[model samples]
Target: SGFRKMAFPSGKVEGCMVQVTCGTTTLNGLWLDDVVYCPRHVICTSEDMLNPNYEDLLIRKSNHNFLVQAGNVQLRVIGHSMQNCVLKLKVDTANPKTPKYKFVRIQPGQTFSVLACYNGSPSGVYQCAMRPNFTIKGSLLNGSCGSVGFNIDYDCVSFCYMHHMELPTGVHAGTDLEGNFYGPFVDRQTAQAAGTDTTITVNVLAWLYAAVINGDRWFLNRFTTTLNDFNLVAMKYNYEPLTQDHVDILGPLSAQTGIAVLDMCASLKELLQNGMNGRTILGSALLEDEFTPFDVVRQCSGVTFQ
Candidate 1:
């Protein structure tokens, strides 16, 4: 009764769906082979793991990470497995505005985390709606982009929707309880200033899940802010690469406990707004944070920003 499995759409997008309804939280996830696609989050393992020649990193659920999105936001890759791999990316396929090409080279046995989403310029907007026929080369590779014979294309791109809402008054967006933070927004006013729609219709847990699952920089930065914080929290409780132990500890906990914002100033200007019932956590900007989650498990782990 806790978890249920079914098919998505019954006709379109061949995949399996899982429904997990817990206290104050309901999760719907679609699984296609090795990757899991959720309403707000997406995570995938290495293609090599499925090969008998390579060890099963999926089961281990350890190391190798990178970020592909930032401000001005498009698609993002937050989570991945422990393997040295390359990310071959190309942008501007349609009319072309100086189309950019980048090869993200990763090392083995360490985490190469990057707060790339906050970067100024994007490599390119990785989206499906771009020109329809526009061709973008996104591949998780075993070799460099120039190598023709060694090119083994790995499917990393997947489509999903994010339900964005405004963070409630007296609470901050992105920052969790104990001040552990994630997400792109700063607060409700920032959200309101960013967009006209400031309604808390759905929830931010899904977005948080996607961000957390994707290993978002703001979140990771929060955890890794200080070595003491890292030791007390990351090393002790929440570790990078998200081990099975972290899941075992933090999985079933409610949003309030799993992740929630701290207190803030409640001014008359704030009180003039509609009074909500429950606490608000996260909100989106001009866009719905509509970034595709990719297969990034092949990147490195436990290293400096890339």
Candidate 2:
């Protein structure tokens, strides 16, 4: 089948005024055009990379499920992609009956790990990892024999970006944000190789940022999460957040010290970034009005032009 032809104005990639017809329902609203043009929105063009019909190889997906299998069970789950932390996970080992159960927490950044007994304790404060992220009660630990298998039902959805554009070697290929041409390319190399910075097709990263922008997830409060993550990183270096007294010394020094005032209220964050009290206090200020990094400074810490 071919894409239903629609006249798209030259040079406009999205949010164009267009009309449509689909089954029994067709509405002309603004537009929600993804690079895929997943038919839930307007079909902006008749020209597809696919030949003749253009839509020949494309199929509408009613629903999609992705699976990665290996060890009988172990789901290192986190919300946004992280090589380090996870929100929740489902494992078959935790429950024999369903084989799929949720575990609230795990040792942070545990990768290439499995179920194993450690330090004579059959527990989770530790799980077996081919590479341990940290040392246990004392020293880096070893693992005990453990069985592995999965009747796992791990499920989730994520946006997949196809940064790979045409290839050959040098021609008018994917244009970058700055609009530079660089590929004589064939059909398999990434845009960067072609010399363009087109990493996923356009309008894709927008989709990823949509939820956070709309505040659908708690992402709006991520300022606190950001601080917590910073704390965790600092702990790795054995550095603690600067305390209030420390801030007191730093504050007055700010008037003449080499460290220019990042902001007057910025001093507040110095105190808050240090510990539990800091996180709680900063969070209160954040949730109060969805303050931005500098908004916090402007409202609380008077800024000194530097």
Candidate 3:
């Protein structure tokens, strides 16, 4: 059959300016450089154009019809080069049950072409899905080519990201002994007069505070001069060792007391020389689990300070 007549769209038909329509009964040649290039003549035999050896250039065909594939389905046409060329793809027959397909605009040097046929079906044995699947019948454009048969198969793949959670650590208390009962020293003269008593009282208060911080009481009650007061203090501050009262009493008494309390709760490990390193009380996993022992201490202790 002789080539058909086509209505050329008004525009410059040279270099990358050429345009063509697919499946049209128009001029059988693609317009380029003001010259009509016939696909059957110029592209059909050109090894680069129909290089069946080039796997990417061939169309994909599959045996199964109803299968959902993830990625894109690509088809490349080698040799013939053109810009903004619309490709038309027809499935089964020229007059397919599903007459519509996809189209792609060709770019220079990009012999490779791609099509994102997300979910495709196999209805008939012979089908032609063009790249730039558009244009009225008989439109003359660049880079036009005849279709060929091919086989294809579908495969599945997955993509994902790894995620994790992290928590803060090394929570500790401050130092200084102002919060201790011996903090009310009256004056340097009075303090000096009963220096030994004051010192002993401070030490006792510290031990009581430590027991309170650790929630360890010698029984619940039983008031005595020494052991009774210690037990009472421990019981009172056991649950809330880090309370404002405890902080006020312990903060000024000695920085070491608070530090030790905090260390007992949550401290980072320190490497030692003999392979026996101090382990972190509150590790990342523990923090992630939302186990704040210090906060619990603060809640239980009814101690507060300004």
Candidate 4:
């Protein structure tokens, strides 16, 4: 009977060790008594979390976004670490025959700098030697990660002077050689004060077109949405009309010139920039007549200006 019990004896027996190894995912290792090992028999590590993309390789393209005709942009590798990490950045310029390849380095958490190049800075491909996990964000193109880099294709776009020229300093009225009324030319005293002043007045219509076309995304989205409803007058001026303010400010000027004074108020500029009564307002009533749909506006206005 004891032998029979021994045949079915219930007790513990030695087994081979599983020898758990670190995983490619999380908490792969740990330190205990100055020794690093897997944390637990079942439970589980990167010694460092990948740095935020902004602090790693950040590329921001503004004003314009078409690859060949890109606009103002910023490409930077930031320092978000308390400890020092050396970084080497490589740049390849967009020269046709023989491109320019350049390299820059970040020593530690000691310095922050910016470098500006011509609008044709070539495709922005930054290969960072330091942390390589974080990727590029915003309008910049995503590129090879194994080699650790990001790139943006940037080219310059030319704009007409009338599209972006600043207003002249002094106002003088006169008829042009074509018998068309034109003036607001610089006065003699104003001209003499700054002999080098070549400031010419910009076209008001051109300014209006540019503003609607090149406005910020938020403004464009809001403006275009409201515009499609054919309510630009309400969108810009609310219940009141611009003529009221125009008459108030330019009444005397209009009467003196015997010309229609539909000028935008100086305050409207501030209103557009900052908004009023918690509502976005237009800088001028000039573009109130525009009925272009948002998509067409975006497509047609994709390339232009400074």
lDDT for each candidate structure: 0.22, 0.22, 0.21, 0.21
RMSD of 4: 28.9
Error of 3 at 285 (Å): 7.0
TM-score against native, each model: 0.18, 0.17, 0.12, 0.16
On residues 51-106, what C-alpha lDDT tens digit does candidate 2 reach at each position?
Answer: 22213222331111111122232222121110111001122222222211222222
TM-score of 1: 0.18
Model 1 clash tally? 14
User: Residues 114-208, candidate 1, lDDT per residue (tens digit)?
Assistant: 11110122121222111111111122121111111000123221222211122333221122111121234421223232222221101122233
Model 3 C-alpha lDDT per residue in residues 1-306, reported as the tens digit of each score: 111111111111111111222222111222222222222222122344323322333223221211111123222212233221212222221211211122222211111111111012111121111111111111111222221111111111010000000111211110011111111221111112211110112222333333444544321222223333333443432211234343354453235333443332221111111221333212211111111222223323432321
User: Native-vs-model 2 lDDT?
Assistant: 0.22
Model 1 bad stretches (over 4 Å): 1-10, 39-157, 164-193, 196-306
Q: What's the residue-level lDDT of 155 in candidate 2?
A: 29
Which should have the higher lDDT, number 2 or number 4? 2
- Cα distance off (Å), candidate 4, residue 137: 11
lDDT, candidate 2, residue 249? 35
Model 3 ranges with Cα > 4 A deviation = 1-212, 215-297, 303-306
TM-score (C-alpha) between model 3 and the true structure: 0.12
Model 4 error, position 159 (Å): 25
For candidate 1, the lDDT comes to 0.22
What lDDT score goes with residue 79 in model 2? 16
Error of 1 at 142 (Å): 41
